[PDB]
Amino acid sequence: GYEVHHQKLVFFAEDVGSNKGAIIGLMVGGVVIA
Amino acid sequence: GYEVHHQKLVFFAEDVGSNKGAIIGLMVGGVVIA
Amino acid sequence: GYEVHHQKLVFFAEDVGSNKGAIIGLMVGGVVIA
Amino acid sequence: GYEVHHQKLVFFAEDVGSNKGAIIGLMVGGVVIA
Amino acid sequence: GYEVHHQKLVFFAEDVGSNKGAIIGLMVGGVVIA
Amino acid sequence: GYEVHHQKLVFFAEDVGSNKGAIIGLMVGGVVIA
């Protein structure tokens, strides 16, 4: 038959330090003022 | 038949330190002032 | 039959430091003022 | 300064009649057997 | 300055009749068996 | 200054009738068995 396994989807895979703006993974519509 | 298993979806996979702005994973519509 | 496994999709694979603007992974529509 | 107004986000903008399956607007994770 | 207005994002703009499967607007992760 | 207005993003702009499979607008990760 079929077999689908172990897919993987990462947006940010390491550290996110000292952010002072906007960090978005997925954004559908909308405004970002940074 | 079929078999679907062990998919994985990560947005932030490591530390998030000293944030002073906006950190969003998924955002549908809406405004972000940073 | 078929077998699909171990695909991988990364957007940012390393550190994101001292951001002061806009960092987006996937953006469908919408405005970004940076 | 800045001014952001009158954005609009619609998922289904017209009639939804005689549904016999699954109609979802936004789905994060989860299984749908239809 | 800046002015952002009257954006618009539609997923389904007309009728959805006699559905017998799966109709999804936005789907992040997850399985759909139709 | 700047002015951004009246953008528009449509996924399905007309009727969707008698569906028996999977109709998705935006899909990030995940399996679809149809």
UniProtKB/Swiss-Prot annotation, chains A, B, C, D, E, F:
Gene name of this polypeptide: APP
Binding site for Cu(2+) 2: Y2, H5, H6
Function description: More effective reductant than amyloid-beta protein 40. May activate mononuclear phagocytes in the brain and elicit inflammatory responses.
Glycan attachment residues as annotated in the record: Y2
Annotated consequence of substituting M27V: No free radical production. No hippocampal neuron toxicity
Residues annotated as site: Cleavage: K8, L9, F11, F12, V32, I33
Site (Susceptible to oxidation): M27
Superkingdom, natural source: Eukaryota
Consequence of substituting H5R: Only 23% zinc-induced amyloid-beta protein 28 aggregation
Name assigned to this protein: Amyloid-beta protein 42
Source lineage: Eukaryota, Metazoa, Chordata, Craniata, Vertebrata
Feature type site, description Implicated in free radical propagation: G25
Summary of subunit composition and partner proteins: Interacts with FPR2.
Stretch of the intact protein here: 680 to 713 of 770
Chain residues that bind Zn(2+) 2: Y2, H5, H6
Subcellular compartments: Cell surface
Interaction with PSEN1, as annotated region: 16-34
